[PDB]
Amino acid sequence: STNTFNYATYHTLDEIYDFMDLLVAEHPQLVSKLQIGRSYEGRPIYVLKFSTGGSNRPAIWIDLGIHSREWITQATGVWFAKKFTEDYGQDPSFTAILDSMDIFLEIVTNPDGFAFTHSQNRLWRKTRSVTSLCVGVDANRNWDAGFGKAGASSSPCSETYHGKYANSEVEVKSIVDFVKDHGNFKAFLSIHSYSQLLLYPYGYTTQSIPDKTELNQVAKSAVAALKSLYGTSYKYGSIITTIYQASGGSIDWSYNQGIKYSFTFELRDTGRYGFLLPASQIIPTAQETWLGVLTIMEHTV
Amino acid sequence: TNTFNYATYHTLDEIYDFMDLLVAEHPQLVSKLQIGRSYEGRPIYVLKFSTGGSNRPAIWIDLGIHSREWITQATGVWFAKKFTEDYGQDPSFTAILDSMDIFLEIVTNPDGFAFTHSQNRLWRKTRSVSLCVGVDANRNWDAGFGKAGASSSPCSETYHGKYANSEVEVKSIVDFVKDHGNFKAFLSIHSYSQLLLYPYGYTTQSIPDKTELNQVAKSAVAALKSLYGTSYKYGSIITTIYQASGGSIDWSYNQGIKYSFTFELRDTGRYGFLLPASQIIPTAQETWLGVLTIMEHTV
Amino acid sequence: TPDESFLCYDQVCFICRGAAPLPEGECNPHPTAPWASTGQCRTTCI
Amino acid sequence: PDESFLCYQPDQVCAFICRGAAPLPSEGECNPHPTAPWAREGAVEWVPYSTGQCRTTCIPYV
Amino acid sequence: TPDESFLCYQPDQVCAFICRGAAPLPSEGECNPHPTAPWARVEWVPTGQCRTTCIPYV
Amino acid sequence: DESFLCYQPDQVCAFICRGAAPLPSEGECNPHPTAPWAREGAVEWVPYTGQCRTTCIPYV
Ligand SMILES: [Zn+2]
Ligand SMILES: [Zn+2]
């Protein structure tokens, strides 16, 4: 049961994949599992779809675990999935959203990296492609948005290696093809750790997005809502001004596709534990982030 | 006390029965001292945690001076159990209790606490009388008594009373602590705001021990935060919440009790005083870490 | 006739002009909550 | 110049940060007082106030 | 937002003002913040707005 | 105040300098306004022909 599932611990890929199956079996009219592709090493890439009908309704995309070592993100994804099924028909705001929109939740965007963090190197970031002294590509530098520009490395050995060309990584290409084929995504949320930030485009350029005022207003609200729970401070602003320059990133890509409500979360913490955030902070992180994610979804609807 | 539900808010009778259970189970470690009777005749109880000695250097912890701050009485109940669970298991806490005594007053304001269960969940003051009832027990201490940050109005929430120690709930502690004469730490537990504060509340004048208490506060907060990520700020009362004259830790500090701190527990105002029962254990656990840190630096 | 604020304890919710919230829950006079799981009402009398 | 105040009321404390104004007598017992973190965080929105403007935020006694 | 009361002295009348986001002009006398005059306790007229009532001197 | 983001294989280091600039050993350094994490973290001036204060984060 997803009721006896331990949300207050970190899970392996198999456990997360089994959880997806449990949750689908328990809520078959709300959630379905979609295979959107296979990872470099041949692991299925799965998206949970949350829907109450319609055909290709306006959708919210949420990706997590694109960088595999950011374990708080996948753990938050698991929590989010359960929360969706717990809150639908109980919370009026979230029921309203789901009554008009679909949610697509990719808990583990980089399954090879994730398996590698459990098997070999807890602090592995990249995919595991060898397109082999220096394995893998930064899946968040691989998107076709300012690809190759400052904030990504042309060196295979560096952590922000962009790869040979945009979409070279099946893990990224799979999302690109899915979102484009769908055509009706209204929000696109990428979930990372750490820093405690809420970011909007761009990372690749100092140019301001045409929707700066609105996205800044949405970020301000979501951060207030997040903070209201446990008093966690977040900062918000464009990627380039608020963390660093990052080219070929997902939300720059999503935004340039016309997905206006494009945001990147950097979850807890600010560096004490960093990627090794304790399991005891999973639930509080997911609970407060949920408030921020919900806030954005309400603004979308 | 093993079958006792720590994840739920208790009435005063439940808490007082709990104390008898704990004394029964741990007779060589904990004793129940009665330090006075409240305005309405309720006994005022302090739990003594000790492994012997005579007049051993002591730590004072008080909770529920302001009755509506229910997280505090609930945390104090959990603390009491925790002390008995961790003595002889945790090396650091064992070292503390082998050298020091701990005095824990779980319900510092029993009349107000009774009132919050029966008439007004958001009552703060004592119940002494006057249509307008009660005195702010944390404005009643003899430390800048009557100065700014207390009210001379009986109807207002920070009413300081007619004179310092006018409230038996305050005088009972003053008498006890002064008679003892060997307290090294004095911790008052409030809610809410997520704050760890040191003197003074009544004056903008810095304490001579500012640097050290600030360092102690910093460690405590870092320790507390590690469990659930609960974000605290720290600093003097007057700079970090507001001016508050006649307060407990300003009094204790002026008695020469150096490690005098006030905790403001969860949350930051979402549920405020009405913190849900689900957060009792999580709060108690993280607050213990902060408290143990201060105790370790005290030893 | 001035504004009187209350705090009522599923959720926590009141600013009234000439009335008080009826047993709306366990209600007591209290300053207006800062935000005005387990939601939150912003209500208004009369 | 920005001046700040703590106003002590019967049930709450309210922070004021003011430009070309000071809290009105209706705000309670107002003391000039350095701004605290909770005040700094909550008093965000300027509103026209007297012949100037203030940002304000309150907490109950805790 | 909140109303501020003023009492004004002119050689020929005393005027009470309750203002929101404004204060009496210099032309309205020696005006200073002061409780509402007991006889002042309707028409808001004008940076903001003041209502005002006067009593004569003789 | 002259500020930089220096992009290394494993981390990004912010530099706020006076009378100096980040040396070649600090990696790929771009003139860049300071981000909040850089202001939070870069608190201690160090000798560096002048001085810099610096702080780093891993790629997140
Ligand atoms: Zn209190
Ligand atoms: Zn990342």
UniProtKB/Swiss-Prot annotation, chain A:
Localization: Secreted
Q: What class of enzyme is it?
A: hydrolase
Q: List the disulfide bonds.
A: C134-C157
Q: Which GO BP terms sit in this record?
A: leukotriene metabolic process; proteolysis
Q: Annotated Gene Ontology MF terms?
A: metallocarboxypeptidase activity; zinc ion binding
Keywords linked to the UniProt accession: Carboxypeptidase, Disulfide bond, Hydrolase, Metal-binding, Metalloprotease, Protease, Secreted, Signal, Zinc, Zymogen
Function field:
Carboxypeptidase that catalyzes the release of a C-terminal amino acid, but has little or no action with -Asp, -Glu, -Arg, -Lys or -Pro. Catalyzes the conversion of leukotriene C4 to leukotriene F4 via the hydrolysis of an amide bond.
On subunit structure and binding partners, the annotation says: Monomer. May form a complex with proelastase 2.
* Protein name per the record: Carboxypeptidase A1
Gene name of the encoded protein: CPA1
Swiss-Prot record, chain C:
Q: Does the keyword Cytoplasm apply?
A: no
Lineage of producing organism: Eukaryota, Metazoa, Spiralia, Lophotrochozoa, Annelida
On whether Plastid is a keyword of this UniProt record, the answer is no
One of the entry's Gene Ontology molecular-function terms is:
peptidase inhibitor activity
Q: What's in the keyword line of the UniProt record? A: Disulfide bond, Metalloenzyme inhibitor, Metalloprotease inhibitor, Protease inhibitor, Signal
The name under which this protein is listed is Metallocarboxypeptidase inhibitor
The transmembrane residues are none
The family annotation for this protein states: Belongs to the protease inhibitor I46 family.
Disulfide bonds, which pairs?
C8-C27, C13-C45, C16-C41
Report the function annotation for this chain. Tightly binding, competitive inhibitor of different types of pancreatic-like carboxypeptidases. Inhibits human CPA4.
